[PDB]
Design a protein around this nucleic acid. Structure first.
Ligand SMILES: [Mg+2]
Ligand SMILES: [Mg+2]
Ligand SMILES: [Mg+2]
Ligand SMILES: [Mg+2]
Ligand SMILES: [Mg+2]
Ligand SMILES: [Mg+2]
Ligand SMILES: [Mg+2]
Ligand SMILES: [Mg+2]
Ligand SMILES: [Mg+2]
Ligand SMILES: [Mg+2]
Ligand SMILES: [Mg+2]
Ligand SMILES: [Mg+2]
Ligand SMILES: [Mg+2]
Ligand SMILES: [Mg+2]
Ligand SMILES: [Mg+2]
Ligand SMILES: [Mg+2]
Ligand SMILES: [Mg+2]
Ligand SMILES: [Mg+2]
Ligand SMILES: [Mg+2]
Ligand SMILES: [Mg+2]
Ligand SMILES: [Mg+2]
Ligand SMILES: [Mg+2]
Ligand SMILES: [Mg+2]
Ligand SMILES: [Mg+2]
Ligand SMILES: [Mg+2]
Ligand SMILES: [Mg+2]
Ligand SMILES: [Mg+2]
Ligand SMILES: [Mg+2]
Ligand SMILES: [Mg+2]
Ligand SMILES: [Mg+2]
Ligand SMILES: [Mg+2]
Ligand SMILES: [Mg+2]
Ligand SMILES: [Mg+2]
Ligand SMILES: [Mg+2]
Ligand SMILES: [Mg+2]
Ligand SMILES: [Mg+2]
Ligand SMILES: [Mg+2]
Ligand SMILES: [Mg+2]
Ligand SMILES: [Mg+2]
Ligand SMILES: [Mg+2]
Ligand SMILES: [Mg+2]
Ligand SMILES: [Mg+2]
Ligand SMILES: [Mg+2]
Ligand SMILES: [Mg+2]
Ligand SMILES: [Mg+2]
Ligand SMILES: [Mg+2]
Ligand SMILES: [Mg+2]
Ligand SMILES: [Mg+2]
Lengths: 94, 96, 122, 85
RNA sequence: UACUCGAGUGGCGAACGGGUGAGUAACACGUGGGUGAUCUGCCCUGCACUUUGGGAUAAGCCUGGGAAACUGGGUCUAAUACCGAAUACACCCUGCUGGUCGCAUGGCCUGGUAGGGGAAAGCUUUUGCGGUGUGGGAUGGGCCCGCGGCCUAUCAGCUUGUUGGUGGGGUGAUGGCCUACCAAGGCGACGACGGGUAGCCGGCCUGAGAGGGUGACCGGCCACACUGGGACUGAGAUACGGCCCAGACUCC
């Protein structure tokens, strides 16, 4: 009862990696951009919907994004402190 | 090798042992991935019920039961079913 | 208050006016008497009550009220203190249980015996 | 240390530190020599040093001193540097 | 005599399980993904092989220091303790050529191609167990993710590896994890940074309810081990009864 070096391990495909969309605000970076997301939620106690925005920054190696533009997001690898979000494709520019 | 444990809860003078399939690395009461029943001797029948299908799937996937668990499985006939020697033997004394 | 003001400021609940500062949240503190003297209640009620100044394990100087009728307390007597307001005495906010440590319940008590710490008849 | 088991473990661990420090120092000297060859700027001697160092790196990794994927990592990084120069 | 055995290696086990909550406002915590970016002994299950030579040490005996713990010097002995070589060509790396998917480098068809490289150990003759690599899976794990989750502006500007790029070094794995140079920015009034408070949560008390309080036990996680640090061992260290150093405490 022999057998080659072929007792492998388990498999795992690739699933859902976070996707989102937002507006670019600061272009004074070099091949990096910060984006803000608009989301709506209701207070757990008040019952009044809430519209607050968080701060995020994406990746671009060429900087085709201008101030005040809408973009989509995909979570890439951690590349710098506080920055891991990477732009997928531009939706509009102004 | 995840082994078939008997999770314990409750108080002192009446211990409880739920049948849990889990890794022996964690605490004796630690993470329970899948529960298939419980075991308690305080009651005289100490009735025990086993889900044959889940027990068999765990055995075929790589979980080796502890000796008392295997003995109780033979009692319930699940060991007999898995071995295929005598077949499936039902002799459990359902509580009066 | 409009909804935006509510979100902006948050609603603040009352801050509790904590009473009985001495026990600092405890149901009991043990102390030693420093003095025994008397004081005169406010104008509506006039009398001659007995109050004791005690040192606490929590290092706080607060008077305590002496229950019952007779007492065996002389300066430097370890005592037990509980929580309770007193209106006749303005600077008094504590009692002194009887029948514990060196403070025994006043003799000749048979009604409400438990409150003052007295044994039965025989 | 108050149990025979633990004291014996400390003895064994000191022995195996002597051994592992020896092996790891050898590996580090190999990598240092490879680095020196590369910043000197040779090709054939660089390749031969790559051969020897890779052989001893693989021996050590199989022995278990260091770990396989990272061994491949620095070996391939060194190969990349060589091919670059 | 081996029934048996002190200690002696060698292993394996000791990272288990038990305890505590001082700090910690943090991806610290519950829930929801994950990885085409990691590993994982002991379990089962299909599937190649396990040739070969060598040396040393404990134990022991003698000697010596020393109350002591502890120590050395010398002789000697064996190995599932040790290392070389044999191969491997299915695995790890590199220079040349198609199809599928798109959520991108690129992944999968072990896609094809040229080079070179690599592992083991035996025990019992009986419900017989061992060693090495990896198409299948699981578990334990790491990373980071949206959201969230005290009070104080009588705390308003903070931050320099700090913030990003490139290149190297580093990690089981991308990344200021570390280094050098480039640009000056990043975080900030949809409350930064500051201060006091305090392990988080499933839950416990209350309330018709929303909500308020709160974290007893059990349990899911976290962090801690006389106070401060660091590192070895390995599949697995915050290493409680594992190691080293510094202070305190007690003692010889
Ligand atoms: Mg296989
Ligand atoms: Mg396998
Ligand atoms: Mg997983
Ligand atoms: Mg435990
Ligand atoms: Mg019975
Ligand atoms: Mg047994
Ligand atoms: Mg002792
Ligand atoms: Mg060295
Ligand atoms: Mg060196
Ligand atoms: Mg190793
Ligand atoms: Mg690398
Ligand atoms: Mg590279
Ligand atoms: Mg013996
Ligand atoms: Mg072990
Ligand atoms: Mg250990
Ligand atoms: Mg441990
Ligand atoms: Mg406990
Ligand atoms: Mg306690
Ligand atoms: Mg704590
Ligand atoms: Mg914080
Ligand atoms: Mg997860
Ligand atoms: Mg292991
Ligand atoms: Mg051989
Ligand atoms: Mg000898
Ligand atoms: Mg011989
Ligand atoms: Mg060989
Ligand atoms: Mg060969
Ligand atoms: Mg070849
Ligand atoms: Mg083929
Ligand atoms: Mg062997
Ligand atoms: Mg997530
Ligand atoms: Mg959340
Ligand atoms: Mg770089
Ligand atoms: Mg890279
Ligand atoms: Mg980095
Ligand atoms: Mg650099
Ligand atoms: Mg804490
Ligand atoms: Mg709840
Ligand atoms: Mg209500
Ligand atoms: Mg309510
Ligand atoms: Mg709570
Ligand atoms: Mg538990
Ligand atoms: Mg708990
Ligand atoms: Mg977890
Ligand atoms: Mg500590
Ligand atoms: Mg530790
Ligand atoms: Mg301990
Ligand atoms: Mg101890």
């Amino acid at each position: 009862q022999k057998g080659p070096k072929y007792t492998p391990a388990a498999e795992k495909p690739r699933g859902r990696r976070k996707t989102a969309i937002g507006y670019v605000v600061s272009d004074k970076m070099q091949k990096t951009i910060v984006v803000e997301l608009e989301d709506r939620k209701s207070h757990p106690l008040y019952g009044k919907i809430i519209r607050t925005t968080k701060k995020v920054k994406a990746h671009d190696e060429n900087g085709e994004a201008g101030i005040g533009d809408r973009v989509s997001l995909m979570e890439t690898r951690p590349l710098s402190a506080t920055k891991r979000w990477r732009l997928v494709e531009i939706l509009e520019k102004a | 090798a995840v082994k078939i444990k008997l999770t314990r809860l409750g108080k002192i003078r009446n211990p409880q042992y739920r049948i849990i399939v889990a890794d022996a690395r964690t605490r004796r009461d630690g993470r329970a991935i899948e529960v298939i029943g419980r075991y308690h001797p305080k009651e005289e029948p100490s009735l025990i019920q086993i889900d044959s299908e889940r027990a068999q799937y765990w055995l075929g996937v790589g979980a080796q039961p502890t000796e008392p668990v295997l003995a109780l499985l033979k009692i319930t006939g699940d060991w007999q079913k898995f071995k295929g020697l005598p077949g499936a033997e039902g002799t459990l004394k359902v509580k009066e | 208050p409009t909804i935006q003001q509510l979100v902006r400021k948050g609603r603040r609940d009352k801050i509790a006016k904590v009473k009985t500062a001495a026990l600092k949240g405890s149901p009991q503190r043990r102390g030693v008497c420093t003095r025994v003297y008397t004081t005169t209640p406010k104008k509506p009620n006039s009398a001659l009550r007995k109050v004791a100044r005690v040192k606490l394990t929590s290092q706080v100087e607060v008077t305590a009220y002496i229950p019952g009728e007779g007492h065996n307390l002389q300066e430097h007597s370890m005592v037990l203190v509980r929580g309770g307001r007193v209106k006749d005495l303005p600077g008094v906010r504590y009692k002194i249980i009887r029948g514990s440590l060196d403070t025994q319940g006043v003799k000749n008590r048979k009604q409400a015996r438990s409150r003052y710490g007295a044994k039965k008849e025989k | 240390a108050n149990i025979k088991s633990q004291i014996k473990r400390i003895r064994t661990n000191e022995r195996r530190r002597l051994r592992n420090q020896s092996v790891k120092s050898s590996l580090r000297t190999a990598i240092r020599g490879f680095r020196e060859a590369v910043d000197a700027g040779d090709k054939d001697k660089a390749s031969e040093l790559l051969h020897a160092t890779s052989r001893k790196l693989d021996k050590a990794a199989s022995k278990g001193v260091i770990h396989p994927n990272q061994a491949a990592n620095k070996k391939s990084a060194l190969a990349l540097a060589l091919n670059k120069l």
